[PDB]
From Swiss-Prot, chain A:
Keywords: Ribonucleoprotein, Ribosomal protein, RNA-binding, rRNA-binding. It comes from the Bacteria. The keyword RNA-binding applies. PROSITE patterns: RIBOSOMAL_L20. Pfam families: Ribosomal_L20 (PF00453). The keyword Cytoplasm does not apply. GO terms for cellular component: ribonucleoprotein complex; ribosome. It comes from Enterococcus faecalis (strain ATCC 700802 / V583). HAMAP family: Ribosomal_bL20. This is Large ribosomal subunit protein bL20. Gene3D superfamilies: 6.10.160.10, Ribosomal protein L20 (1.10.1900.20). Belongs to the bacterial ribosomal protein bL20 family. SUPFAM superfamilies: Ribosomal protein L20. InterPro entries: Ribosomal_bL20, RIBOSOMAL_L20_CS, Ribosomal_protein_bL20_C.
UniProtKB/Swiss-Prot annotation, chain B:
This is Large ribosomal subunit protein uL4. The chain holds residues 53 to 206 of 207 of the full protein. The lineage of its organism: Bacteria, Bacillati, Bacillota, Bacilli, Lactobacillales. GO terms for cellular component: ribonucleoprotein complex; ribosome. Signal peptide: none annotated. Residues 8-19 have a biased composition (Basic residues). It comes from Enterococcus faecalis (strain ATCC 700802 / V583).
From Swiss-Prot, chain C:
Part of the 50S ribosomal subunit. GO terms for cellular component: cytosolic large ribosomal subunit. The lineage of its organism: Bacteria, Bacillati, Bacillota, Bacilli, Lactobacillales. Keywords: Ribonucleoprotein, Ribosomal protein, RNA-binding, rRNA-binding. This is Large ribosomal subunit protein uL15. Belongs to the universal ribosomal protein uL15 family. GO terms for molecular function: rRNA binding; structural constituent of ribosome. The keyword Calcium does not apply. Binds to the 23S rRNA.
Amino acid sequence: ARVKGGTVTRKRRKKVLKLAKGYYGSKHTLFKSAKEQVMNSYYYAFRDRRQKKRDFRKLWIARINAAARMNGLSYSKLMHGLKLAEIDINRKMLADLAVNDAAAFTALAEQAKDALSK
Amino acid sequence: NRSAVRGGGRKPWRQKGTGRARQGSIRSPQWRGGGVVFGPTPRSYSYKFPKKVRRLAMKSVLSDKVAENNLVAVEGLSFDAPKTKEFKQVLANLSIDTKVLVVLENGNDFAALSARNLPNVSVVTSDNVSVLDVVSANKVLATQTALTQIEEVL
Amino acid sequence: FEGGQTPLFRRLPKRGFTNINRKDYAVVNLDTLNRFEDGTEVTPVVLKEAGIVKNEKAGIKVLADGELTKKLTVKAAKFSKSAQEAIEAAGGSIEVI
RNA sequence: UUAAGUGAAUAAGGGCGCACGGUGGAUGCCUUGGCACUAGGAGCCGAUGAAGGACGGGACUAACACCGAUAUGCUUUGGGGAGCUGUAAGUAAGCUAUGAUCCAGAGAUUUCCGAAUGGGGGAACCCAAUAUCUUUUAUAGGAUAUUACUUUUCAGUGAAUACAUAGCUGAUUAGAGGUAGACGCAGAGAACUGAAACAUCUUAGUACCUGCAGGAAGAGAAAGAAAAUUCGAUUCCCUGAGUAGCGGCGAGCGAAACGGGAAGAGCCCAAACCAACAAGCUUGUUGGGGUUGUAGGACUCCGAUAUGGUAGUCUGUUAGUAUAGUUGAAGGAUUUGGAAAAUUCCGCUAAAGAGGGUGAAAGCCCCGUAGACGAAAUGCUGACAACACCUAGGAGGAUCCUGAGUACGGCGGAACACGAGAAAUUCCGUCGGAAUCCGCGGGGACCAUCCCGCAAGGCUAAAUACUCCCUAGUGACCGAUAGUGAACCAGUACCGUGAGGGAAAGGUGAAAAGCACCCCGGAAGGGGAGUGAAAUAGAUCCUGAAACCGUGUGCCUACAACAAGUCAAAGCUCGUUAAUGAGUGAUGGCGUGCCUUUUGUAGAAUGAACCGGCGAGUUACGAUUGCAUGCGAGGUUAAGUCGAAGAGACGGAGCCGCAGCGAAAGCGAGUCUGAAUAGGGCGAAUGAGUAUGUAGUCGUAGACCCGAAACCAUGUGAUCUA
RNA sequence: GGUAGCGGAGAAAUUCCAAACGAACUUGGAGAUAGCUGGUUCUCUCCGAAAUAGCUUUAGGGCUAGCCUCGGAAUUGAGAA
RNA sequence: AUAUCCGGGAGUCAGACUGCGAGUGAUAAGAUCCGUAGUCGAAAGGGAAACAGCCCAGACCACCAGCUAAGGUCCCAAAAU
RNA sequence: AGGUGUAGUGGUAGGAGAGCGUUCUAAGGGCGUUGAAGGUCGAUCGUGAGGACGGCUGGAGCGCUUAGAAGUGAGAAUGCCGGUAUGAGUAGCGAAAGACAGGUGAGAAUCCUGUCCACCGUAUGACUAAGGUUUCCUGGGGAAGGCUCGUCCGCCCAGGGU
RNA sequence: CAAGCGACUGUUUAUCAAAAACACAGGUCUCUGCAAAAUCGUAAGAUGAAGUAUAGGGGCUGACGCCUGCCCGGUGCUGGA
RNA sequence: AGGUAGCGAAAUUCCUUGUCGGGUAAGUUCCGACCCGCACGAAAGGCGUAACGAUUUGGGCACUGUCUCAACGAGAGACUCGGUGAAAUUUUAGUACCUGUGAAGAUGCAGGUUACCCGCGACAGGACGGAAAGACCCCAUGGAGCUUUACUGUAGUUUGAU
RNA sequence: AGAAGGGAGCUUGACUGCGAGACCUACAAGUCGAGCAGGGACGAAAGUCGGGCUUAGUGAUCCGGUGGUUCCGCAUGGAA
Ligand SMILES: [K+]
Ligand SMILES: [K+]
Ligand SMILES: [K+]
Ligand SMILES: [K+]
Ligand SMILES: [K+]
Ligand SMILES: [K+]
Ligand SMILES: [K+]
Ligand SMILES: [K+]
Ligand SMILES: [K+]
Ligand SMILES: [K+]
Ligand SMILES: [K+]
Ligand SMILES: [K+]
Ligand SMILES: [K+]
Ligand SMILES: [K+]
Ligand SMILES: [K+]
Ligand SMILES: [K+]
Ligand SMILES: [K+]
Ligand SMILES: [K+]
Ligand SMILES: [K+]
Ligand SMILES: [K+]
Ligand SMILES: [K+]
Ligand SMILES: [K+]
Ligand SMILES: [K+]
Ligand SMILES: [K+]
Ligand SMILES: [K+]
Ligand SMILES: [K+]
Ligand SMILES: [K+]
Ligand SMILES: [K+]
Ligand SMILES: [K+]
Ligand SMILES: [K+]
Ligand SMILES: [K+]
Ligand SMILES: [K+]
Ligand SMILES: [K+]
Ligand SMILES: [K+]
Ligand SMILES: [K+]
Ligand SMILES: [K+]
Ligand SMILES: [K+]
Ligand SMILES: [K+]
Ligand SMILES: [K+]
Ligand SMILES: [K+]
Ligand SMILES: [K+]
Ligand SMILES: [K+]
Ligand SMILES: [K+]
Ligand SMILES: [K+]
Ligand SMILES: [K+]
Ligand SMILES: [K+]
Ligand SMILES: [K+]
Ligand SMILES: [K+]
Ligand SMILES: [K+]
Ligand SMILES: [K+]
Ligand SMILES: [K+]
Ligand SMILES: [K+]
Ligand SMILES: [K+]
Ligand SMILES: [K+]
Ligand SMILES: [K+]
Ligand SMILES: [K+]
Ligand SMILES: [Mg+2]
Ligand SMILES: [Mg+2]
Ligand SMILES: [Mg+2]
Ligand SMILES: [Mg+2]
Ligand SMILES: [Mg+2]
Ligand SMILES: [Mg+2]
Ligand SMILES: [Mg+2]
Ligand SMILES: [Mg+2]
Ligand SMILES: [Mg+2]
Ligand SMILES: [Mg+2]
Ligand SMILES: [Mg+2]
Ligand SMILES: [Mg+2]
Ligand SMILES: [Mg+2]
Ligand SMILES: [Mg+2]
Ligand SMILES: [Mg+2]
Ligand SMILES: [Mg+2]
Ligand SMILES: [Mg+2]
Ligand SMILES: [Mg+2]
Ligand SMILES: [Mg+2]
Ligand SMILES: [Mg+2]
Ligand SMILES: [Mg+2]
Ligand SMILES: [Mg+2]
Ligand SMILES: [Mg+2]
Ligand SMILES: [Mg+2]
Ligand SMILES: [Mg+2]
Ligand SMILES: [Mg+2]
Ligand SMILES: [Mg+2]
Ligand SMILES: [Mg+2]
Ligand SMILES: [Mg+2]
Ligand SMILES: [Mg+2]
Ligand SMILES: [Mg+2]
Ligand SMILES: [Mg+2]
Ligand SMILES: [Mg+2]
Ligand SMILES: [Mg+2]
Ligand SMILES: [Mg+2]
Ligand SMILES: [Mg+2]
Ligand SMILES: [Mg+2]
Ligand SMILES: [Mg+2]
Ligand SMILES: [Mg+2]
Ligand SMILES: [Mg+2]
Ligand SMILES: [Mg+2]
Ligand SMILES: [Mg+2]
Ligand SMILES: [Mg+2]
Ligand SMILES: [Mg+2]
Ligand SMILES: [Mg+2]
Ligand SMILES: [Mg+2]
Ligand SMILES: [Mg+2]
Ligand SMILES: [Mg+2]
Ligand SMILES: [Mg+2]
Ligand SMILES: [Mg+2]
Ligand SMILES: [Mg+2]
Ligand SMILES: [Mg+2]
Ligand SMILES: [Mg+2]
Ligand SMILES: [Mg+2]
Ligand SMILES: [Mg+2]
Ligand SMILES: [Mg+2]
Ligand SMILES: [Mg+2]
Ligand SMILES: [Mg+2]
Ligand SMILES: [Mg+2]
Ligand SMILES: [Mg+2]
Ligand SMILES: [Mg+2]
Ligand SMILES: [Mg+2]
Ligand SMILES: [Mg+2]
Ligand SMILES: [Mg+2]
Ligand SMILES: [Mg+2]
Ligand SMILES: [Mg+2]
Ligand SMILES: [Mg+2]
Ligand SMILES: [Mg+2]
Ligand SMILES: [Mg+2]
Ligand SMILES: [Mg+2]
């Protein structure tokens, strides 16, 4: 028999337009522009789920570096000293101690400095 | 198709220079009102299985009805005059309330007449019985002479 | 088509001819004649009814492929020399029709 | 106080989200109409004026439909039984139980143009002759009839020119055009195309043009097919077979007979000879006679005036049938609702549970359906009768007959599947040119032998092809961008000098109940009030998408360079399919669209303004492989017949497989090569096929879709311009 | 009023023949042909090339081979390092 | 842990750069033509500021976890002023 | 039925496999005026095509399961048709003189009347052939047409006129 | 005032060329005895002409003035045979 | 058979702006002359020529906004307001500069620099701006028109046989 | 140069049927070949010889010519 276009076409395009809500001007309005930008958004979103892991480790290291220097030590020497002392605390936890519990961070720094001397 | 659609002989406009897409006919398929590309064309859908396969199929459905005890054989179905209510009562007599294929011997006009109007009944003669006839029915009601004729046919 | 390289068939010569009077015989081998009982008269009609030879072509020719084990009086258009010996060695007999 | 520092809020406009509107007409549902077919009907109409038109006819009439100055109808025969005066309302005026409207059969009327046909003409107009009638005192005016051309036959007149003949006048007779854009036969006859170019060839003897048709046509009753020994007109279907062959032996082209089916049917002339008549012993007319190949007939003998047959006729009679019709079972409540057929409850009818309609979905409300029944009239068919028309057996061969400028041959073309080829068979043009029963033709050059037939005369039903129309239906066909170009006043509007091209455009509601009245406004249009179940159903009227346009505002925005997102993120505003929620987003990191085409494109290559709809590997027949099922050394039927446009049954002709090898004779589990028991090639040893389904791919077809410049063949144009 | 497309007409320009004339317009053959350009619409999973040789009136086309994929058979395991 | 072999289905026959070995060229060319390896093609990620073909390395996915490669560690900008 | 272990899971041309969704058919089983399809919204589910569930709109039909058949999936073809944007409130409004008074009217630079002014005058006058074919006259009208306006018109309506 | 080109008036590429291009009067060659040659047409029938060599067709040249040389081997034409 | 008369750097002369003379302050053009005529030449005529030409060419007089070198004035458009209201184009655009990079010429990539938001009148450097599927160039075993001692045919013409 | 170069005698193996197995190769082709049989040349014999030191000296099919032939011969014998 004859199968006319029906409603499938509209349904499919409406899904893309919903993904494009909040985009500027025609990019949330017109299907072709919206689909092109949703594709680019997907490309960015996948790439950025990898990049966010890089960015946060970059943030923690910088914060640990600032706290390390306040304890008479560079970031690189502190991580060497913690490794020598068998401390497995990760950079997310160290950065959190650097900001929220400075006394605990100082206790870790002292253990690292002790391990470096030995 | 584009040849069958009315008109469309001439080239709509010159090949080059108008800035328009080149077109060869107003009845080209991408045109509104143009010829259909491919699409239905009259044809038959019938094919014939090997005879041995036809015979096996017919025996299978008949043996399936018996195996499920859906084959109700009656000595005979007699009616002085065709009356639906009476055949309807016979179906009640035999406790048949589901779709039934009533298989009658040749010449039993009045049994066929009285059975056929019931919405759950399908009537065939013993010499015109098909696989689709049997499979459709939940039950087969066959007179004794109809069964004998079937066994002579098969 | 080979894109313009002389096609294989043009490279090769035509050979032979077809004989207007050519006669092709329907072949029956001895193993097929073991299907008949001892003393049977095997005939082109009998073979047709048996469904062994539906088309006898120019005639039935009997060939000695297998081993014959029953005694028969075989009738056919032609007999291979070996088939004749086998049929008669089995104590049967052949007849050219 | 002073100094230094930090520092919100604000928006002219804009962004995002959300809400509500407008525009528009997608989507859904629906359908007036289409598409493809099946069964039957009918396959022609015209000088007795056709097809197709023009102009007219109504109480008002622009259009359509109907009708034709007897005009929106007349008579008549049937049917039908209460309303009717079409679409189309409205008023108006009428008709109808003394039977209207309406329906069917048969008649009457049927202006003008158009073959048109008294003459003319730029179709639907103009202008005559002759006769009769009529108007007027009369002329003028009006009415009816007849008057084209050619053909056939007859008569009469009648030239050069004697008789004649031709011509001429009249009568008689018959054609003249149109279609159904189909089917048939015949004349004439392309090109693009394929051959990967191209002249043979192919496309094709196709398209186109022209003639002639007929409901079918054509073919047809053996100078046949054959060589199993036989068959016994033709046509068509299956098969033979993509075989034999043809072929720049390329591309391609491609049989036939046998076998199986559908359907079947045979007959008349010419000649000899006889008789009659007429004419110049023959030489015509008529009638008889006669009709062919195991030769027939004439003829001469005898012997029967029977028996059978028919593809005869407005010959009646009869039956059936088509074209109007009649009859035709069975439901009430309850719940919901504007409405019930939905629902629940109990019932009933069914030879009817096909289908449609009805305020939603109805076997039981309506129209119907199954079934029964019906014909004044006119067709059509079948019988029966009548009438007409055909239909003799056997024996004899002395003689006579049995199709001539024919057969055939040379030359040139063509048709045969067969392209001149070794080319038979058939035909056309040209020239030559037989025999005739002790004869003649064919059996694929040709000859002999044998076999089969008997040309140069004609006719013939059925099986086959097609469908503009008519009737009843059908569809895993369309559902308004589809389906016919056209569901709607479409071949219209519109474009064009013309041939010719050619659209768009369906939906209020169950019912108009189509919004009285009021209010603003000149109106348009609104607001109320009403109608309605609903009017955000108000006629641009069902649903009412998107682009696009606007209004409100939760958050953000006036130091910022941004394919505009993404990841991180305060603040603010909100509260969900309750989910480790939603909107917005300062600020920070990262980041050059989509597609096509390319070595490589963000690309300063291509394509898209946007949104919506439509828009591209399909089908048929064949080849082949995988998968699957049935059967298996077997597998399987085709056409066709019966049957629901079904399954199925029958049908074994045929096809594949079971044996190969060889160019072939031929041999055969081998065979070919060869001197060879050799070696080697291909086979067997060392078996699986076949039917159907399904999918992949291929081939022939437009073959996935769109696109040339061009080529060819009919037509239309010199109202521009030379 | 006459001449019409295989044509006409041309104090001649390939000039005119109904607003494009080295050959009008229209309809048909006809869906001409197009080894060329463009386009070819849902998803996920497994595997995954080539841009080379030979021949070609062949060079931006094609054919066989090479390289990919799917299925199958089988051997004293024939592959790779 | 592939190889052949049999069969169904293809696509490909414009390649590019880089290193190395040659020719052509002026031992010019992002030149041209072979050989050889790689990458691109058909490969995202990190480095080379940006930068198909270079260096490191092959993305089934989730993580605000860890270790490294090339390359880096004064600020932009992660890490030794 | 699942479990463990090891390994593997970039990809164009292209091959293979397995699915999603669309319309229709058959059978079965169902849902619908207590509201079908369709539309719209939502913070919902699945590995993907995609699937539910609610609110609103809507007013009649439509799912589901298994199998079948397909005019079965669009974003690109300077694709076809329709609608609507952008450029924009932008170009343009087609060779020239008008002014004022009075009137008409809901409304007048634009209609009527008056006055003066200006323009053509081998004409921009008067006839007539062709061509057009009702455009002529009278009375009304202001939707559209008129490149603005309009009370006016070669337009529309109703009558008439050779 | 002067030079080129064309004698002159004319004609032409409607819509990019008006000219030195075409035409022209004049020149020359050649065909044609009339059912002429030439042309349209299958043909019939036409034009040429209701003309007749002082006419008609065709080629070239291009008012006028002065002039127009050499080559007949080749190719055509004509005659021979 | 070897070009005669006449003409000649020519509408013909490549070298070439030949050389000489004239005209100019200065002359690749123009005129006169010369003759090595690349490659004039006698009816596809040679040479000359009064008259003629919207013909080509050089000089002169007059004349001037052509120019030195631009100024002012009139009108129409542009501009502002009222009415009316298109178009080509357009992947979405919050649309800077430099140097660099890259399919080797970037508003958009890198680095740096500059830049508050929105317009209006102006100008055209860029958007390899718009318009037209380059016409040049090459290619396609494309097309068409034209030519001939290309091939194969053929109308016509002619000759013979019949 | 244990010749493949050079001379001489006799010769025709510059044989017929073939050919395990290899090389080359997309195909079509191309290349090498021991060995077997027939009948030989030279040589006393062993043995060598299916051209030449090796590698170029060539052209598919269609269509024709010529020679041979226990093949076919469109009813049959012939013929074509
Ligand atoms: K604001
Ligand atoms: K007429
Ligand atoms: K028809
Ligand atoms: K051709
Ligand atoms: K071709
Ligand atoms: K007939
Ligand atoms: K065939
Ligand atoms: K060929
Ligand atoms: K008779
Ligand atoms: K009903
Ligand atoms: K009757
Ligand atoms: K022949
Ligand atoms: K014969
Ligand atoms: K015969
Ligand atoms: K509504
Ligand atoms: K908003
Ligand atoms: K950002
Ligand atoms: K370009
Ligand atoms: K062998
Ligand atoms: K042998
Ligand atoms: K099987
Ligand atoms: K198959
Ligand atoms: K196709
Ligand atoms: K195909
Ligand atoms: K004219
Ligand atoms: K002219
Ligand atoms: K393969
Ligand atoms: K390299
Ligand atoms: K790789
Ligand atoms: K909903
Ligand atoms: K399709
Ligand atoms: K598009
Ligand atoms: K617009
Ligand atoms: K705008
Ligand atoms: K008025
Ligand atoms: K001139
Ligand atoms: K002149
Ligand atoms: K002169
Ligand atoms: K002029
Ligand atoms: K001219
Ligand atoms: K002269
Ligand atoms: K002359
Ligand atoms: K001349
Ligand atoms: K002259
Ligand atoms: K000469
Ligand atoms: K001569
Ligand atoms: K000179
Ligand atoms: K010269
Ligand atoms: K000087
Ligand atoms: K002059
Ligand atoms: K002039
Ligand atoms: K001035
Ligand atoms: K580029
Ligand atoms: K600019
Ligand atoms: K052309
Ligand atoms: K020697
Ligand atoms: Mg669609
Ligand atoms: Mg067409
Ligand atoms: Mg455009
Ligand atoms: Mg259509
Ligand atoms: Mg008839
Ligand atoms: Mg009556
Ligand atoms: Mg008349
Ligand atoms: Mg071709
Ligand atoms: Mg009833
Ligand atoms: Mg009920
Ligand atoms: Mg032929
Ligand atoms: Mg003959
Ligand atoms: Mg002849
Ligand atoms: Mg006989
Ligand atoms: Mg017939
Ligand atoms: Mg339509
Ligand atoms: Mg619709
Ligand atoms: Mg239409
Ligand atoms: Mg509503
Ligand atoms: Mg609506
Ligand atoms: Mg600043
Ligand atoms: Mg700020
Ligand atoms: Mg390139
Ligand atoms: Mg782009
Ligand atoms: Mg750009
Ligand atoms: Mg574009
Ligand atoms: Mg005409
Ligand atoms: Mg005329
Ligand atoms: Mg020219
Ligand atoms: Mg013109
Ligand atoms: Mg064709
Ligand atoms: Mg892989
Ligand atoms: Mg070749
Ligand atoms: Mg290079
Ligand atoms: Mg590529
Ligand atoms: Mg990369
Ligand atoms: Mg790339
Ligand atoms: Mg740092
Ligand atoms: Mg340091
Ligand atoms: Mg991976
Ligand atoms: Mg639906
Ligand atoms: Mg489709
Ligand atoms: Mg679109
Ligand atoms: Mg502007
Ligand atoms: Mg004006
Ligand atoms: Mg004046
Ligand atoms: Mg004047
Ligand atoms: Mg008037
Ligand atoms: Mg008036
Ligand atoms: Mg107006
Ligand atoms: Mg002149
Ligand atoms: Mg002049
Ligand atoms: Mg011009
Ligand atoms: Mg001009
Ligand atoms: Mg001249
Ligand atoms: Mg000079
Ligand atoms: Mg000067
Ligand atoms: Mg000088
Ligand atoms: Mg000259
Ligand atoms: Mg001369
Ligand atoms: Mg001259
Ligand atoms: Mg304005
Ligand atoms: Mg660069
Ligand atoms: Mg740059
Ligand atoms: Mg950016
Ligand atoms: Mg970057
Ligand atoms: Mg441009
Ligand atoms: Mg191009
Ligand atoms: Mg013979
Ligand atoms: Mg014969």
